[PDB]
């Protein structure tokens, strides 16, 4: 697990460590794996990025 730099979670306002769940539809919306696992924002397709690079 790595920190995705300058990314904040729009579910819990924490950092995004490990997989980043970035919404494909909204311009600027992201979930940490805990907020993704709780079923936040499930109306929109996302990209799941296991690491920043």
């Amino acid at each position: 697990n790595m920190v995705h730099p300058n990314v904040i979670c729009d579910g819990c306002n924490g950092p995004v460590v490990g997989t980043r769940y970035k919404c494909s539809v909204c311009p600027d919306y992201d979930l940490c794996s805990v907020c993704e696992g709780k079923g936040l924002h499930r109306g929109h397709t996302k990209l799941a990025f296991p690491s920043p690079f």
């Binding site: 300058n6 904040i8 729009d10 600027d28």
Partner: peptide, 4 residues
């Protein structure tokens, strides 16, 4: 979100 991005905090740039």
């Amino acid at each position: 979100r991005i905090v740039p």
